[PDB]
Design a protein around this nucleic acid. Structure first.
Lengths: 97, 153, 214, 97, 81, 91, 127, 25
RNA sequence: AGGUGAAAUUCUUGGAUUUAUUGAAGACUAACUACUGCGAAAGCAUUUGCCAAGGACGUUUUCAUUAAUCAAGAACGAAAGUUAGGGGAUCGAAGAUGAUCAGAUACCGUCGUAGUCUUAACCAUAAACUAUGCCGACUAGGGAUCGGGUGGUGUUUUUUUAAUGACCCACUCGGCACCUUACGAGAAAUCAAAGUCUUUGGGUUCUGGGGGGAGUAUGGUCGCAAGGCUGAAACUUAAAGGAAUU
């Protein structure tokens, strides 16, 4: 259940929501998980796919977006990029993502 | 300003000269500003995409098609109006299609047609109410409004 | 006042090559008259009859074969395997009470340009020491039944169109591999291929139809 | 008053069935209130059965059977079909033979 | 009927009926110190597992959790308790 | 609040016109005026900027839809007809 | 070994058509309707009419030269009685006694789907 | 006199006496 | 040819009715399918895919009285009727007419608009029946049958005893009804519930009081209406009704 998997990661680990903060966490080199929404700008996505390989991270085209990925990441506000620095007690490193 | 369905301001290049003339297709209920349109039998079946009907099958609905395969638009031009396609006989290209009141016209498979219905769902299925929206209705059509009844004059 | 029997010329039927007596039968044609010819005056006909007769196998008391008239040569029509049928008298026969009936339908194409839709019926049977006066499937079991039913049909279709398919159609080699899956779940009785009908051929190419006709 | 267990005809466990049309005067009567019978007889009469096999071809052949179903409306199933207003006691009685 | 004792009754109609209508509800299950082939240990496995019970040292699988008592997985030596 | 009752946004057409007419208007009138959702930016900033046009307040995304709704029963099933046939398009 | 075919008898209530044709039938031979051999309305499905009707179709067959035939009986069915009329009784015994090679006989009546309404009403045909 | 057709009689004399009293509304 | 007790209208010899190769529409899901499954009621009768639900069973898991039933109030509520648009294939209120008939405005016949059904809203009624409220444990045996569970050196699966799936026997709770007496109840019919009721009291919702007038007058109130929820009185009348017998 990818649902409850990131529930714990936001319940422990270091996560950063938002283009700046995520590309800023990537420009530092300490995030190993970036989740893109298959509906947000592909212009935005195109660079993040290009950074994915530049920052050696396992991408994952999320079956959701702003009010989909945001819905589970427990926040009334919208977001489509969940660039995870280091996970808490959940192994989203070695899973179906 | 004289139609109840938007117009595709689809701009095109010209592979024969470095330049881009804006062609003008029609709007399809299910397209975005910046959406991608593809013309050429060698293109995937998608809304806004226009290739001869020798590219699609039965059940597949399109709009702004012809009667004369390639007259640059003809049939399939109206709000909430659509055109389905039934039969499809190859060799000497002659497909069978379904028009509005229940009309069926067969045509060559090199007949241009854009996939998708013209924007304007249940438009006239709504009352005009005020003769006002009735005046300005024809204010961009023609002075056919109003209509003096014969029996009285 | 002419009694048109004098007109209608007599014909003769000739099956492909995978049938018992190729000389299937003698029927009527149409003498060439006003605004009409002969060879291209019929063809748009069929050839349904007792398969046991056209297969000379008396054990096939039921079952029927359907053939669409293709091209004629020498006033000797060379019919083509148009399909298969099932005498309504055997359908009801296999449909016994206190059990569950299962009709299956699936589509499949051949690697040699051709499309048809074959069938495969099934019925629930008892046990060696069955006691209950019923015996039905577990529904989800009926799902695994029909799952591999259409599955196996489309697994041996790829090859020599329906020419090699009829080579396993009437001999009932179908029941053999289909009964293999049905064993590890629920026994079931009969389990044939019921009927079937064509819908798309390559063209009127009797050049390919030369393998059976020679 | 009520003179049968399953009210008028077998109706217990559910709330509504699906009426099938009578095979006589088409009167629409519930499938549970349907008096059926399988007349899987032959096509041969009561005399030309042997005359058939005689003036026939094939080694006796096999001969066909027409497995039919007879649904009844009750009103017309009494003006003929098996019934004849059974006895009081044996009203409960049921039998296959 | 008529007269019966309900203190020292037949251990038959006692450990067969519903362990809720018998008397003091008694669990009809148990655990198994099944051996894990490939090491030297044993795991205390509960009959009705449901959750895939596996090994701890050279992890593998103990018994697949069925719709009752998780039957062993082919080669596994089960032992009552 | 309740400054109306059953008349809603069509209580302006008072005595003028007929009851039945306005009733119908209400359903569709209530439809295009409504702050629709731009399912491309995921924020309901789209709205009837014109007939068959629904502009997004974010990324300024104009949208082709219906004469009153972003998409009625028409483009609905047809949009899936393509998804359905787009299956034998690459599969 | 003979010139087989089909008879296609139709045992409808108040009628019976015995038109012997070919395996395809696209080309038919004879037909002889029930009321042809008897004008009375009341006797369209009557037995004596079936014999006389199937007696004339037998003579017409030995005229073209057909030997074997397959009788495919048909009931009105569909959304009708579905019960083979009294005609399809003395009609079979009519061409059987006439002298023909009665072959692989089967049946193919209209499959009453029940789907389409059965003309009468919910309160049925209250004769 | 079954009440099915009698509930229909009062029904007709209902629209009837409602429109006569609604005549002098 | 159609049709009926038998006729006639109707399609007739410009090829009907009947046969067959094809095509489309909508409808429906036959046979399997029954004193069975599931659903809150109404209901739901084909297949697959997705998306969730529900519910029995079983568990040496969690909480811990959280529950029971319910005025007013709220979701769903067959069908008819209805606002309107995708479209009425059949059938078919109305109607038209063929006879029957002393008559036939009916019953049977021919055609045929509403409706059918869908897409979005409605009305809230049905012998909406189990004419029997929900919840509680106990007074009873049997055979069945449904779902899951345990036990079987048992049947088969045989490709090796390979693993096991289906089947057979005992029991089991939760399903579905039936059969048997009925201890008891009950006016009887019947009923394992209507038992545990003059030896009358486990909790509780709702309703009824001789019959008509009468779900009617009127008011309110819901409904686009039809009408629905609500609901009299005067007057008259000694019988009305239920069950079972003759």
């Amino acid at each position: 259940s990818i649902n409850q998997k990131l529930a714990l990661v936001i319940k422990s680990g270091k996560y950063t929501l938002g283009y700046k903060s995520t590309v800023k966490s990537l420009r530092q080199g300490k995030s190993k998980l970036i989740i893109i929404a298959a509906n947000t700008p592909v212009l935005r996505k195109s660079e993040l796919e290009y950074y994915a390989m530049l920052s050696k991270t396992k991408v994952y085209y999320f079956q959701g977006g702003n009010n989909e990925l945001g819905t589970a990441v427990g926040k009334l506000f919208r977001v489509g990029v969940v660039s995870i620095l280091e996970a808490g007690d959940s192994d989203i490193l070695t899973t179906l993502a | 300003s004289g139609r109840g369905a938007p117009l595709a301001k689809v701009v095109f290049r010209d592979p024969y000269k470095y330049r881009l003339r804006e062609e003008i297709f029609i709007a399809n209920e299910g397209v975005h500003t910046g959406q991608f349109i593809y013309a050429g039998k060698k293109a995937s079946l998608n809304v806004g995409n226009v290739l001869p009907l020798g590219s699609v099958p039965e059940g597949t609905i399109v709009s702004n098609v012809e009667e004369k395969p390639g007259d640059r638009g003809a049939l399939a031009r109206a709000s909430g109006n659509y055109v389905i396609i039934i039969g499809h006989n190859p060799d000497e290209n002659k497909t069978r299609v379904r028009l509005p009141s229940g009309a069926k016209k067969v045509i060559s498979s090199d007949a241009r047609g854009v996939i998708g219905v013209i924007a304007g769902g249940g438009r006239v299925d709504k009352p005009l109410l005020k003769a006002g929206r009735a005046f300005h209705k024809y204010r961009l059509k023609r002075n056919s409004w109003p209509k003096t009844r014969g029996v009285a004059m | 006042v002419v009694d048109p029997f004098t007109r209608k010329e007599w014909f003769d039927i000739k099956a492909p090559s995978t049938f018992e007596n190729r000389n299937v039968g003698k029927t009527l044609v149409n003498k060439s008259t006003g605004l009409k010819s002969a060879s291209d005056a019929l063809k748009g006909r069929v050839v349904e009859v007792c398969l046991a007769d056209l297969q000379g196998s008396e054990d096939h008391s039921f079952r029927k074969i359907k053939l669409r008239v293709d091209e004629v040569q020498g006033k000797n029509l060379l019919t083509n395997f148009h399909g298969m049928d099932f005498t309504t008298d055997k359908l009801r026969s296999m449909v016994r009470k206190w059990q569950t009936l299962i009709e299956a339908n699936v589509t499949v194409k051949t690697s040699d340009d051709y499309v048809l839709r074959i069938f495969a019926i099934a019925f629930t049977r008892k046990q060696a020491n069955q006691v209950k006066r019923h015996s039905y499937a577990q529904s989800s079991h009926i799902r695994a039944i029909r799952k591999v039913i259409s599955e196996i049909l489309t697994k041996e279709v790829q090859g020599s169109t329906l020419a090699q398919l009829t080579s396993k159609l009437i001999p009932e080699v179908i029941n053999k591999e289909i009964e293999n899956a049905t064993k590890d779940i629920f026994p079931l009785q009969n389990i044939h291929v019921r009927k079937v009908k064509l819908l798309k051929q390559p063209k009127f190419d009797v050049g390919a139809l030369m393998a059976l006709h020679g | 008053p009520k003179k049968r267990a399953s009210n008028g005809r077998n109706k217990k466990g559910r709330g509504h069935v699906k009426p099938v049309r009578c095979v006589n005067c088409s009167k629409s009567i519930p499938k549970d209130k349907a008096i059926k019978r399988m007349a899987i007889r032959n096509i041969v009469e009561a005399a030309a059965v042997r005359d058939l096999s005689e003036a026939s071809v094939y080694p006796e052949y096999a001969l066909p059977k027409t497995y039919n179903k007879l649904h009844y409306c009750v009103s017309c199933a009494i003006h003929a079909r098996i019934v004849r207003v059974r006895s009081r006691e044996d009203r409960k009685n049921r039998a296959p033979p | 009927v008529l007269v019966q004792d309900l203190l020292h009754p037949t251990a038959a109609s006692e450990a067969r009926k519903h362990k809720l209508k018998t008397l003091v509800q008694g669990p009809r299950s148990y655990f198994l110190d099944v051996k894990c082939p490939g090491c030297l240990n044993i795991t205390t496995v509960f009959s009705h597992a449901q959750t895939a019970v596996t090994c701890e040292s050279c992890s593998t699988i103990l018994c697949t959790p069925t719709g009752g008592k998780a039957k062993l997985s082919e080669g596994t030596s089960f032992r009552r308790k | 609040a309740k400054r109306t009752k059953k008349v809603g946004i069509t209580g302006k057409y008072g005595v003028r016109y007929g009851s039945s007419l306005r009733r119908q208007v209400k359903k569709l009138e209530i439809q295009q005026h409504a702050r629709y959702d731009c399912s491309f930016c995921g924020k309901k900033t789209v709205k009837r900027g014109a007939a068959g046009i629904w502009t997004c307040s974010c990324c300024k995304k104009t949208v082709a839809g219906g004469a009153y709704t972003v998409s009625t029963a028409a483009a609905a099933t047809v949009r899936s007809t393509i998804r359905r046939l787009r299956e034998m398009v690459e599969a | 070994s003979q010139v087989f075919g089909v008879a296609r008898i139709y045992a409808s209530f108040n009628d019976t058509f015995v038109h012997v044709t070919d395996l395809s039938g696209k080309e038919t031979i004879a037909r002889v309707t029930g009321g042809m051999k008897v004008k009375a309305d009341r006797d369209e499905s009557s037995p004596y009419a079936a014999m006389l009707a199937a007696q004339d179709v037998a003579a017409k067959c030995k005229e073209v030269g057909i030997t074997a035939v397959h009788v495919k009986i048909r009931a009105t069915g569909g959304t009708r009685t579905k019960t083979p009329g009294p005609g399809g009784q003395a009609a079979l015994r009519a061409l059987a006694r006439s002298g023909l090679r009665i072959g692989r006989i089967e049946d193919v009546t209209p499959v009453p789907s029940d789907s389409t309404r059965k003309k009468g009403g919910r309160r049925g045909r209250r004769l | 006199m079954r009440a099915k057709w009698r509930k229909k009689r009062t029904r007709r004399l209902k629209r009837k006496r409602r429109k006569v009293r609604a005549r002098s509304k």
